Symmetry: C2
Subunit: 292 residues, 2 copies
């Protein structure tokens, strides 16, 4: 099957891109594996129009609106191989598809420290993004898990949402500079080894003592969901927390005819930005179909 564009990933970025291509009366296929990065929280925040709505509902509304266009197609599957040919995609199911252009919108995967109790609380009481989930902590106690330079900056912003403690876990020991800057912002440093997280977000130390937090934040590392960008030769840069696919102003990668949007690009990390640069990418892809 030949399409004008195939969009790999059918969450916020992919749907936004696909909608532009559909509205341009071109034949577009979304191939989506169905595991969004935000499948862990009960509510989304920060997107005007969708504030406080469930992520499942946001994603379903968008799928419904895209598929109102009969020239848009959907397939629940995973792309395992992409190659120049236009482009040919091979899916985990064994199905092959072809397209003149591609839009990469497959997202990133969060990689968490190996701390007993932490991962089961992801999106419930342990978070990455204070604009996304800080407000609902209601000014209570917040723990920031230390893990390098960006943790220190996060801890310095976090007092906006509640009383903040920087937790070193007996590993990430701040230097003189970092240390003095925390003390001025009123951020306590706790250096004890953490054995596990219990209850809502209570840190239990190796010596048994507990520190009860209302929420924990981590500036955790992220990986690309798929090797498809690397297969296609798309330039990938290494950010402080993980890789992203390079793009220009029109969201085009270093590989002509392959565009990228959402969390896999440099300005990502939120739904608002996924929607915005997804739309840029979809319009750009269409413009390249017409003018080259």
């Amino acid at each position: 099957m030949l399409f004008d564009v195939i969009v790999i990933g059918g969450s916020h970025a992919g749907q936004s891109a696909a909608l532009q291509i559909a509205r341009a009366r071109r034949r577009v296929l979304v191939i989506d594996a169905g595991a969004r990065r935000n499948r862990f929280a009960s509510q989304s925040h920060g997107v005007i129009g969708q504030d406080g709505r469930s992520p499942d509902a946001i994603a379903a509304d968008g799928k419904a609106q895209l598929l109102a266009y009969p020239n848009a197609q959907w397939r629940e599957d995973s792309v395992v191989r992409a190659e120049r040919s236009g482009y040919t995609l091979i899916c985990a199911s064994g199905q092959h598809y072809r397209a003149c252009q591609l839009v990469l919108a497959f997202g990133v995967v969060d990689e968490l420290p190996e701390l007993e109790g932490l991962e089961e609380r992801w999106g419930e009481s342990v978070f990455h993004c204070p604009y996304c989930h800080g407000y609902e902590l209601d000014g209570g106690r917040i723990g920031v898990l230390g893990s390098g330079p960006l943790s220190y900056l996060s801890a310095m912003l976090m007092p906006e949402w509640g009383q903040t403690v920087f937790l070193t876990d007996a590993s990430f020991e701040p230097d003189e500079e970092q240390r003095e800057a925390l003390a001025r912002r009123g951020v306590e440093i706790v250096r004890d080894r953490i054995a596990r997280i219990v209850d809502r977000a209570t840190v239990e130390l190796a010596d048994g003592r507990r520190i009860a937090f209302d929420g924990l934040f981590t500036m955790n590392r992220m990986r690309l969901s798929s090797p498809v960008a690397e297969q296609l030769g798309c330039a990938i840069e290494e950010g402080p927390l993980g890789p992203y696919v390079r793009t220009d102003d029109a969201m085009e990668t270093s590989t002509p005819g392959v565009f990228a949007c959402g969390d896999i690009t440099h300005r990502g990390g939120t739904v608002a930005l996924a929607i915005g640069n997804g739309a840029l990418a979809g319009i750009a892809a269409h413009r390249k179909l017409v003018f080259g």
Copy 2:
């Protein structure tokens, strides 16, 4: 009356301003939106191209967003127009009502105003059968007949694009004359050129030419000029640059203008023209404005 000091005031309360204000509200800071109630998109019955809001009424989109923002008790709204902005030892905004408001930082989100050509009947049909943006309204023309009202060199590229959505006539109207490469290009794309002067637009979408001929269209497009809705950006000393279709307020990667503590978002910035873009860079502006409150 009791004194108020807002961490941020957002001037303009449509897509861009609401998106910015929401970030600030979620950062537990005090935010005021002052909005004059005249969105650029107050003429069309449906909005398109924003995933989640595709095909919904602009009025409903605006109302839903306003209600969501005002659910935060640290967010406030005023239906007013800022007539003057000045720097003090933060910022003071003077409104048409005579009310004054005080802010530490500002987000400009006041949009642009479409400057339509003086063609009889065109303004009456703006947002009904006459449009600016083909991604916004091309699809609903259903492969119909489309007229591209000539406005100069930029109308040529529009005419070359429009066959994606329907059978296209380039109404050059003495504003443009294709050379040879361009006439061949239009011809290869299946675009008809009509050179006679346009007298009038009548009925729903019929072009009435100087010689008396009538051409019925299903929709018309104009690559019209736009101006900033307010002099507030200039009052604040914000650098303004001339774009191909009108001026924009200059912004850096953090959506900050040349004036520290004044940010901008939406159609008044270099990348605009759509709601999706307004929401995206409004969110950038709100987060950036918050970050400056904390770190300077």
